[PDB]
Amino acid sequence: HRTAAHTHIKGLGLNSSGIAEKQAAGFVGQCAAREACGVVVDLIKAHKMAGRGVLLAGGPGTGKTALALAISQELGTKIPFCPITGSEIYSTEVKKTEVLMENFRRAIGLRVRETKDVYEGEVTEMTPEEAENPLGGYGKTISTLLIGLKSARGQKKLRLDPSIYEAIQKERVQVGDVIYIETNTGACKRVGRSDAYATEFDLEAEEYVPIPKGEVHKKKEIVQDVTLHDLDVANARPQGGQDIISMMGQLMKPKMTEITDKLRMEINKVVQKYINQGVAELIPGVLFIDEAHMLDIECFTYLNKALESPIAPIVVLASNRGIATIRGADDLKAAHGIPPDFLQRLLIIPTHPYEPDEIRRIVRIRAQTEGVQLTDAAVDRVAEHGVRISLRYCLQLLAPASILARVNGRTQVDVQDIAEAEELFLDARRSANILTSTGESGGLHGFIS
Amino acid sequence: GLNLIAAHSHIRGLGVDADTLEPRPSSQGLVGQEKARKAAAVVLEMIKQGKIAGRAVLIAGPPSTGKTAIAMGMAQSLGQDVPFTTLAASEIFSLEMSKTEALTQAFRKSIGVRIKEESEIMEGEVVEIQIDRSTGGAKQGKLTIKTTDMEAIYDMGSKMIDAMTKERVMAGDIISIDKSSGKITKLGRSYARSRDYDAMGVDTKFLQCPEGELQKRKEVVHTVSLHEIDVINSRTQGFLALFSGDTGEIRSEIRDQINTKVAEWKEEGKAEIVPGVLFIDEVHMLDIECFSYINRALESDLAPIVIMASNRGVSRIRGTDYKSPHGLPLDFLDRVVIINTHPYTPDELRQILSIRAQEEEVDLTPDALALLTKIGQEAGLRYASNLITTSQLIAAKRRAKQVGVEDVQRSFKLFYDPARSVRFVQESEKRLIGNDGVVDFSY
């Protein structure tokens, strides 16, 4: 429903031969770049290579971000697409190379089958049994809980460990509640009151729920999608146990930490065992670093290590800059704003500025996508602004002009509505002329320089 | 498996004769760089003998001349028996700790303490368990267990009954017991009892019964770095910081105590010290404060050997406004020896591209290999190696069995090399954002 800058892009619009159709899937042109992005898509779906780099190089507005979004749509929702700008790397909580590693590991997926081994029932009886600790100083402790669980099919009595009773205490369970006990974690969930007690006459909005069907004891098979980053984080700041560290970890403020390479190599071995057990399959995906010129020489130096990793994702960089100074390396200038050293690692896909007829065709696609009807004179007038000023500028006029048309009661945008939109809504260069013309005047009505 | 094909996957070692240290023209995945590979072979001898402390070696050379390749060769030829620490210099700029702390930690990771410990361990298939609960539980119980060679009953103490009931041990389970501590690990399930396992899905695997003695004195060899001993001693569960990474700046009196303690264990023979190596890739990204620290951190008897790589010419040292060879201060370079790597000849480019093509799954026609070699001479070894993957994917899409010249030519046309992309930005200059921020969006 809501329409954004790239809502018309649906894919790369390629033939089965890997050749670009001149207008397909929302694209016009960029055919050589769309074909190169098609080969990138097939590099990813092959899931055989680690740590290949791609640079989308080309001026602002030449569809580099459209192409990266089209890759994400060609890959589909199974494969991790991890998009960031270079400005996102500058965390205050952790070093910049940490968020590089997190995003590298968000780009690597895992699908894993999990057995939940579990107990369910209406709580029929519940009875604690106690330890008379002589000299600990904390007084007594509870040694076990005996609890009776009843389902529709059968019944059990469980002698719970103290740490599982603490889970039940946290869950505020009472007799006649229906509860769930995941033995994997030792976590307890209160599902509700038993429907045997269903009555209006309690002030609190209780969940009255039926008795669980089947056996009290069950094993559930669940297929889970996780990334390596989800595993890293789960084991860095643990919260799954009923131990005291896990317990207090749920109360303290969330905090990112500079996760060590020891934890990452340990989790590689954990995942390798899930793969060898056949319960998991690896789904390596891609990290898209938009605005990659906003990185710095320390980031690029770190990618030289990170891309050597034997399970690194595929990395797609976009840059829009000519010969430019490398950030943090103020004496060094290079093409794309990328160090010469790191540029040797990339495959560069150049993107090119549009012809007037391509711009005219994009205007029609975009008008159809925003749902607005134009006359051909209107489409030509907007296309002229796309040629004379900028594609982005002319596409920004469609929504204002549609309102201005509707305000006069006409449902179709014609040249008068664009002629008004041009005058209400200036571009960067007409505005820069107003600045420059006025800036001869000082005093009250000058622009501040 | 998990491990995919990466840039260095073909490197299996240094490719050097163990008797003479003469490098072979190609072996173990390394082609050429013979003078540099011989020097790296002498450094491996220094590392493996452990005698010398705190040598620093710089691998200096142009980009893509095998500086990382040789570093991977050394790591692979030391194997798992020695601490090898791979630091990117960019990592020292932590927010969690100072640069010199991060350099101390990196040095401390690179010295191992090697410790040998026995345990009696009991391993076998469970024939039976009975437990008496009276009703508070665990009053008494008996375990029957077997191998293919032996069967025994054990009377169990109540804390072993708690271990057994915790790990839900049942008949047919194949278990190991570390009887020095009584943790029990369920190695698997016997096939002979498969039908007892009514709650196990069809995906369940089954083992054969264990072999020999039910009880064995297994000997374990541990290597723990000095950094691990430091971090263990930092707080009540300090070892967790080896994973979450939130070590603070660990106080130096802790380290001094540990240095004394380990020298004590060495002289008592309780432990051995295993000096490893620290690799610092892109050492030129360190600053003048890092170098003045490293100067004196190398002087310890608990210093590893350090190995460093630089692409840089006469270049500005970070944290100062003057320039020095390799980007490194002469103050530091006095304590360093340099190994220099050269550019490749065309037959070396041909061989490296061949090895890269055989490490990848790529059937490559001779004319495609010749074309990729010429591209290598003109566009560089990395670009030609990136075209191998690309041409395979193009060949596959047209259903071809081999990568032909046709596929390399599509790859060359679709993806620019750095020199063509530099030309592209120079010809496209007004449409790209220049260093003055100016750009023209118009046609």
Place this chain on the structure above:
Amino acid sequence: KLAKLDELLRELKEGGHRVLLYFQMTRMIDLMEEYLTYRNYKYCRLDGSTKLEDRRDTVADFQTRPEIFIFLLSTRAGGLGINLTTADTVIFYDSDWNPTIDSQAMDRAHRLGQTKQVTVYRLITRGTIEERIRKRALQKEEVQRVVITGTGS
């Protein structure tokens, strides 16, 4: 479907209508029966698992008393037999490929003695295999008027 059914059942119950729901899957009669118990609707059920005396009485119950809102009814076990003429609404939650059977089901309501105008709803889901079902059924009912017309004798 169940969303659009829930809206439709509310509009019908606020309308005072009484409804027969046909299913091609008896497990959907179980799931639907949960939803009904989780709301205020008094209901009855027939399908191919019920014993014949239960069929006799549940039909008699439904025809007896207007407090019962909804009658869940499997397509084949429930489409063929006796009058249900104090319904007024028929919903095919799922539609049989053989259009005759849906016709029999509809005409358990649309029958001699029928109290009010029968309205039939069919909960077609756009873009699913359900479209093929209703196409095949509509083709077949056309063929079944090519291959007969006229009184006979």
Place this chain on the structure above:
Amino acid sequence: GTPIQNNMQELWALLHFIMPSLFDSQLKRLHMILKPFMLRRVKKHVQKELGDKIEIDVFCELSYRQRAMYQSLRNQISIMDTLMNLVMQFRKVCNHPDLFERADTSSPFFCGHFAETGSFLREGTNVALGYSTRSLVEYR
């Protein structure tokens, strides 16, 4: 009330049943040979007070859970060359996604060791639940 069914041989089985001396085993001819053996009055000509069956093919649309299932199942048709399975499996999610795979009490992936139950039958009515939950990252 619906003799014609799927095809004409499936009509012959009903005609053979009544008159197997006559019938054993061009469409316009049929109406003139069935006429002695069939009678079919129809509710437009008869019982005119029973006003016509008002009908609404609703053409409602999938929910998000259904289309997530549907697309993963429709992907199998692209892999094909099994519709004898899939038409019902599609029809199942058309009716309700819990028929295909029922939604249930759920939790995050647990990245840890625990001792799972090997037999439900041998567990009995009284059982001790120890705390088995343990990390797979296992520092020695």
